Amino acid sequence: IDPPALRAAFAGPLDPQHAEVLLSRYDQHASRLLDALHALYGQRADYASWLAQWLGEVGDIARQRPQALQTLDSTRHAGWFGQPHMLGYSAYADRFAGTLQGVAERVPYLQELGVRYLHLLPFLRARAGDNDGGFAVSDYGQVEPSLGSNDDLVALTSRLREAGISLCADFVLNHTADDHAWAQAARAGDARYLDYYHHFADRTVPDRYEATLGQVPGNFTWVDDTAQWMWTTFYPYQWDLNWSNPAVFGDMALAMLRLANLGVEAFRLDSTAYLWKRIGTDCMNQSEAHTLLVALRAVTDIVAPAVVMKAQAIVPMTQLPPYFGSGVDEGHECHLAYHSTLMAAGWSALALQRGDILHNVIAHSPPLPRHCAWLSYVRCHDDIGWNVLQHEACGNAAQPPFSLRDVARFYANAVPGSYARGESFQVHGTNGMAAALAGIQAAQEAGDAAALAVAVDRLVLLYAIALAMPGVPLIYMGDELAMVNDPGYRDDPHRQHEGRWLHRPAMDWQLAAQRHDAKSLSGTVYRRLRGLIRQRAALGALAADQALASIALNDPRVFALTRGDSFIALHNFSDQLLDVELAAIGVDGWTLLAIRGDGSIVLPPYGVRWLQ
Numbered sequence: 001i002d003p004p005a006l007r008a009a010f011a012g013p014l015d016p017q018h019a020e021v022l023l024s025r026y027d028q029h030a031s032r033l034l035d036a037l038h039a040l041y042g043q044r045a046d047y048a049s050w051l052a053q054w055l056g057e058v059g060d061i062a063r064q065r066p067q068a069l070q071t072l073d074s075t076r077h078a079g080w081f082g083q084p085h086m087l088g089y090s091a092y093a094d095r096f097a098g099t100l101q102g103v104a105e106r107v108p109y110l111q112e113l114g115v116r117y118l119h120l121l122p123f124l125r126a127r128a129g130d131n132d133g134g135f136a137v138s139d140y141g142q143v144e145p146s147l148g149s150n151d152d153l154v155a156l157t158s159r160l161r162e163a164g165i166s167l168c169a170d171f172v173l174n175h176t177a178d179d180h181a182w183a184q185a186a187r188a189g190d191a192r193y194l195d196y197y198h199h200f201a202d203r204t205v206p207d208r209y210e211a212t213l214g215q216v217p218g219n220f221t222w223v224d225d226t227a228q229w230m231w232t233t234f235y236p237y238q239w240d241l242n243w244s245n246p247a248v249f250g251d252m253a254l255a256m257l258r259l260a261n262l263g264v265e266a267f268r269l270d271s272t273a274y275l276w277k278r279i280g281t282d283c284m285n286q287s288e289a290h291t292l293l294v295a296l297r298a299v300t301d302i303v304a305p306a307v308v309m310k311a312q313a314i315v316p317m318t319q320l321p322p323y324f325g326s327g328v329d330e331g332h333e334c335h336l337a338y339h340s341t342l343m344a345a346g347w348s349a350l351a352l353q354r355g356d357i358l359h360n361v362i363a364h365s366p367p368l369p370r371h372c373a374w375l376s377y378v379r380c381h382d383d384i385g386w387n388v389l390q391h392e393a394c395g396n397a398a399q400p401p402f403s404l405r406d407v408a409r410f411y412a413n414a415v416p417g418s419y420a421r422g423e424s425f426q427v428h429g430t431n432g433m434a435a436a437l438a439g440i441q442a443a444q445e446a447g448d449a450a451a452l453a454v455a456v457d458r459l460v461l462l463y464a465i466a467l468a469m470p471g472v473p474l475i476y477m478g479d480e481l482a483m484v485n486d487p488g489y490r491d492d493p494h495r496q497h498e499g500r501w502l503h504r505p506a507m508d509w510q511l512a513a514q515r516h517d518a519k520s521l522s523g524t525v526y527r528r529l530r531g532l533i534r535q536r537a538a539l540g541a542l543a544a545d546q547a548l549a550s551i552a553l554n555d556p557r558v559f560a561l562t563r564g565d566s567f568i569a570l571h572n573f574s575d576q577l578l579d580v581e582l583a584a585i586g587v588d589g590w591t592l593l594a595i596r597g598d599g600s601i602v603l604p605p606y607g608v609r610w611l612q
C-alpha cells in the first residue's frame with residue numbers, strides 16, 4: 001500500500017526523454033489497476049513484493065515500445081475504432097497468403113476493399129501436431145515458424161500501419177498448449193510453473209468443481225508427466241491458466257504488451273468468459289473475470305493506449321454489457337464485443353423471412369457505453385452458434401416465437417426446399433461459408449442464373465446489416481468474392497473429422513482477380529459490398545457514438561434500423577416485392593447511393609434501402 005514506491009518501481013526503467021507522458025498516464029489510471037489487483041491478489045503475503053517487481057518489468061516494456069507506436073499512443077483519440085471508415089477483415093495468414101510476408105504483399109488488396117482492421121487468426125507458436133487451428137498456444141511471444149518470424153510480424157504491422165490498417169491478434173489468455181514452456185517446466189517438476197495451472201492430485205477437488213460445471217468430456221485431463229488432473233475446459237491439450245496466481249497475471253500482462261510492441265493494435269480475448277474459477281459456480285462470466293479484464297485494460301491505458309481489447313464471448317445479449325465494464329468500471333474494460341446475437345438473428349431472419357426477429361434484437365440491444373462498440377459480422381472461422389438466440393426464440397409481445405431447430409435444419413439442407421448448403425457441426429451449430437448458406441452455391445451447382453441473382457441479394461442484405469452497426473463490421477475472408485464451401489478437408493490427411501474446415505478455404509486469388517469484372521459473380525458481389533462500405537464511410541451518422549435503434553413495423557417481413565436521427569436502413573427479409581409507408585417510419589428524405597422521395601418506399605425481394 002505504498003503508491004510512491006510503486007510509482008518509482010514503474011518509473012525506473014523509463015528513459016527521461018519519454019517518461020513524462022507515460023508517468024502522466026500512470027498517475028491517472030494506476031489507482032484503478034491497483035484496486036483491481038488488490039481485489040484479486042491483495043490478501044496474499046507475497047502480493048506487495050510481486051507487485052513492485054512486476055511494475056518494474058512493466059516499466060521496462062513501456063520503455064521499449066517503438067517510437068512510432070508511442071506516437072500512435074499519443075495521437076489516436078478514444079473511440080477511434082468506431083468511426084465510419086472502420087471496416088474489418090478476418091483471415092488465417094496461411095490460408096490468405098501463406099506466410100506473414102505473403103500477407104504483407106497482399107495489403108494492396110485489403111486497401112482497395114477499404115479494410116482498416118485486420119484480424120489474423122492464431123499465428124503465434126502452436127502445439128506440435130494437433131493444436132485446434134492454432135488455439136493451443138505454445139509461445140505467446142513468438143510467431144509460428146511456418147508463418148514467419150517476429151521480424152516478419154514487425155514488418156507486416158509497419159506495412160499495415162502505413163495503409164491505415166490495425167492488426168487484431170488473438171490473445172488466448174484462458175489456456176495454453178500443453179507443450180508451452182510453462183507447461184514443459186511443470187512437466188519437468190518445477191513447482192513454480194506447475195502452479196501457473198489448476199492441478200490436482202486426486203479427483204477429490206475436481207469432482208466438487210464438476211458438480212456445478214458445464215462441459216464444453218468433463219473439464220479435466222489426466223497427465224502422466226505431472227501426475228495430476230489438469231483443468232482443461234476445451235481440448236485435453238489446452239491447460240487452463242491459474243489466474244488466481246499473481247504470477248500468471250503478471251506474465252500474461254507482459255506478454256500482451258510485448259505483442260502490442262510488435263505492432264498488435266487489437267486483442268481478441270479468447271474464451272475470456274472462463275478465466276475465473278470458484279467452486280459452487282459455473283466458472284463462467286465471474287465477477288473476478290471482469291476484474292481481470294479491468295486490470296489488463298488499465299495496463300494498456302497506461303502503456304499502450306492506442307490498443308483496444310475485444311471480448312470473444314459467444315453468449316446471449318444479457319451477458320455482454322458487463323464486458324464493457326459494470327457499474328463503477330463501465331468504460332474501463334473491453335472496447336469491443338462480438339454481437340453474436342445479431343449475427344445469428346440475421347441468418348434466422350433470412351431463413352424464416354422474418355424481419356421482426358431483427359427488430360427484436362436491435363430494439364433490445366443494450367446501448368453502448370461511451371467509447372465502446374460492437375464487432376458485427378456474418379460468418380467467421382467457427383460454426384454459427386444458434387443457441388445464443390434461445391431467449392429471443394421464445395418470442396415476446398412483438399415477435400412470435402421461432403424455431404432454432406428448424407433454422408439449423410434449413411441451413412443444413414436437412415429439409416426439402418432449402419437453397420442452403422451448410423452442414424450441421426455437432427441445437428447443433430452450422431458450418432459453411434456465407435455464400436454457401438445464402439444460396440449462391442446451390443444456384444451455381446444448378447446453373448440457375450435467376451436463383452444466383454437472388455442468392456447474391458441475400459448475402460449482401462446480411463452484410464448491409466453489419467455495415468450499418470456502431471463499431472467494426474468484420475468481413476470473413478472470401479465472402480467479398482462469394483467463395484463457397486471447401487469439401488477438400490474430407491480428403492486432407494489430418495483434417496477430416498474437423499468439419500469447420502468446410503468454411504476455412506484457402507484464398508482464391510484468381511477469383512480475386514475477377515473482382516474487377518462486373519459481369520462475374522465475384523465481381524458482382526465485390527462491387528455491391530464496396531458500395532455499402534463507401535457509403536458507410538461517408539455517414540457520420542454511423543459512428544459508434546451515435547444512437548442505434550429500430551422502428552417497430554407491423555409487417556413481419558420488414559426490418560427498420562436507425563442510426564442517430566438522420567439515418568434509416570430498410571430491409572426486406574422475404575422473397576416478395578413489398579413496400580413501406582413513410583408514415584410507419586416518419587420520413588421523406590434522400591435515398592443513398594449504396595447502388596429522394598415522398599412516396600412509399602418499395603422494396604424488391606431481399607432488398608435494402610439506406611435513407612438520409
Ligand SMILES: OC[C@H]1O[C@H](O)[C@H](O)[C@@H](O)[C@@H]1O
Nearest residue numbers: 132135234235270271381382
Ligand atoms: O478453445 C478452442 C476454441 O477457442 C475459440 O472459441 C475459437 O473461436 C475456436 O475456433 C476454437 O476452437
